[PDB]
C-alpha cells in the first residue's frame, strides 16, 4: 500500500545532476548519486553483519546504475525505509523485507553487504515469478530445421534451458520440435508438472537435438494446439502459451490460427534467435495477432533478459483484475541467497496507478512496479512446534 501510494506521486525528473539520490549500493568496498557508508554491526538471527539504519540496494551487473529509470526508481523507493523500520518495530523477529522492482534493482532491509561474478537477477527469483503472473501451461515449440544449425542452434538450446528455469511446480510445460514433421523431444508426450526431475529431463532432451530438414509451421502449430487441448491429464487450467523458438520464415499460416484459437484463448510468444537476415514479418505477426509478444535474442548476453520478460505480458489480467488479485502467496522451501538457510517467502504484487483518479493514462498501468517479499525461516516454524 505504501509503495503504491508513494509511486503514484512521482514527478519523473529527467536529470539528477543538481539533486543527487542518496542510497547504499551493496557489493561495494559516477555522477548522479551519493553513496552511504553504514556501521554494519554484527547481529544474531542473521549469519552476517547488518545495519538497521537504512536499506541496501542491489543492482545486477549488466544494469547500469545512474540511468534515468534506475535513478527514478532509487528516488521513489526511498520512502520504503520508513515502512521497513515500522515493520521491524512491530516485530523485532522479522527477517529480510525486500522489494524487487521490474527495473531490476532490489531494495531490502536491513542493510547488509552482498555475498567471483554475480549473476543474481531479482526478476528470475521464484518469489518474484510466482507473484508476477498466475500459473501457466507453457508449450515450447523449437524450429530444428536446416537453417538453425550452427550458432543459432546452441543459442536456441541455451534459451530453452534458461526459459525452463522460470517455471515452478505449479506450472506445466512440454517441449516439441518440428521440421516438416512435429514430435516431442522426449518420452513425455503430454504436459508434465515441470518439477526438478521433469525440467532436468526436458533440458537433457533439448540438449540432444540436431538441425536438419525444412520448416513447416502449420504442422508444428497444429501439434502445439492439439497438445494444449488434452484434458486427459493433470494440468494448470490457467494461462496457455505457445513459445516459438525460431529464426525467420515466410509463412504466417492464418488457417491454423483461425481454426484452433478463433477466440484468442491461447497466447503466442515468438522468439527470433541468432544473427541472420531472414524475414521476421510473420514471426512478429503471429505474436501481435495472438495477444503475445516478440523478442529478439542475438547473442548469449541477451538470453537472460529476454527469457524472463514474457511475465510482463502475463501480468496484464492480474493488474486489470484490481484489488481482488492481491493475495499473499508462499513459495516452496528454498535456500536464501544471503546465506540464511531454508526459508519461505511471502509475495504481494505492486501496481502502477499514477493518475488513475482521472482514468486517462491506462497505457503503462498494465504492468507491475515490482514484487514485495518477506522471509520466514523454518527455524521459526520449528520453534513454534516444541
Amino acid at each position: 500500500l505504501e509503495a503504491e501510494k508513494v509511486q503514484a506521486a512521482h514527478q519523473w525528473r529527467e536529470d539528477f545532476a543538481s539533486n543527487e539520490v542518496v542510497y547504499y549500493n551493496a557489493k561495494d568496498d559516477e555522477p548522479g548519486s551519493q553513496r552511504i557508508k553504514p556501521v554494519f554491526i554484527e547481529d544474531a538471527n542473521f549469519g552476517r553483519q547488518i545495519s538497521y539504519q537504512h536499506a541496501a540496494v542491489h543492482i545486477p551487473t549488466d544494469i547500469y546504475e545512474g540511468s534515468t529509470i534506475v535513478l527514478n526508481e532509487l528516488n521513489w523507493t526511498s520512502a520504503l525505509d520508513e515502512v521497513f523500520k515500522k515493520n521491524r518495530e512491530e516485530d523485532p523477529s522479522l527477517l529480510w523485507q525486500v522489494f524487487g522492482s521490474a527495473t531490476g534493482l532490489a531494495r531490502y532491509y536491513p542493510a547488509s553487504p552482498w555475498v567471483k561474478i554475480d549473476l543474481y537477477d531479482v526478476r528470475r527469483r521464484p518469489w518474484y515469478i510466482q507473484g508476477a503472473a498466475s500459473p501457466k501451461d507453457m508449450l515450447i515449440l523449437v524450429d530444428v530445421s536446416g537453417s538453425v544449425s550452427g550458432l543459432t542452434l546452441k543459442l536456441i538450446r541455451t534459451s530453452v534451458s534458461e526459459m525452463l528455469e522460470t517455471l515452478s511446480d505449479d506450472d506445466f510445460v512440454n517441449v516439441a520440435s518440428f521440421n516438416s514433421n512435429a514430435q516431442d523431444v522426449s518420452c513425455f508426450q503430454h504436459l508434465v508438472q515441470a518439477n526438478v526431475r521433469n525440467k532436468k529431463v526436458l533440458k537433457d532432451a533439448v540438449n540432444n537435438i540436431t538441425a536438419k530438414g525444412i520448416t513447416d509451421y502449420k504442422k508444428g502449430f497444429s501439434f502445439a494446439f492439439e497438445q494444449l487441448l488434452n484434458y486427459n491429464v493433470s494440468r494448470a487450467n490457467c494461462n496457455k502459451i505457445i513459445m516459438l523458438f525460431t529464426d525467420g520464415g515466410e509463412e504466417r499460416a492464418q488457417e491454423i490460427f483461425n481454426k484452433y484459437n478463433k477466440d484468442k484463448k491461447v497466447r503466442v510468444f515468438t522468439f527470433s534467435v541468432g544473427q541472420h537476415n531472414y524475414d521476421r514479418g510473420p514471426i512478429q505477426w503471429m505474436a501481435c495477432e495472438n495477444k503475445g509478444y516478440y523478442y529478439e535474442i542475438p547473442s548469449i548476453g541477451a538470453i537472460r533478459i529476454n527469457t524472463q520478460e514474457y511475465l510482463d505480458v502475463l501480468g496484464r489480467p492480474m493488474v486489470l483484475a484490481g484489488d481482488k488479485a492481491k493475495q499473499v502467496q508462499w513459495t516452496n522451501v528454498y535456500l536464501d541467497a544471503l546465506e540464511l538457510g531454508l526459508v519461505i517467502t511471502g509475495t504481494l504484487p505492486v501496481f502502477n496507478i499514477t493518475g488513475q483518479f482521472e482514468n486517462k493514462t491506462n497505457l503503462k498501468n498494465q504492468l507491475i512496479l515490482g514484487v514485495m517479499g518477506v522471509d520466514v525461516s523454518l527455524e521459526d516454524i520449528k520453534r513454534l512446534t516444541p
Partner: peptide, 23 residues
C-alpha cells in the same frame, strides 16, 4: 491440488504493443 486463482483473457487487455512495431 492446484491453485484456485486464474487470471487471463480479460476483455480490457490492451495487447496493442509487440516487439515488432517498437523495433
Amino acid at each position: 491440488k492446484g491453485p484456485d486463482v486464474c487470471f487471463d483473457n480479460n476483455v480490457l487487455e490492451d495487447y496493442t504493443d509487440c516487439g515488432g512495431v517498437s523495433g
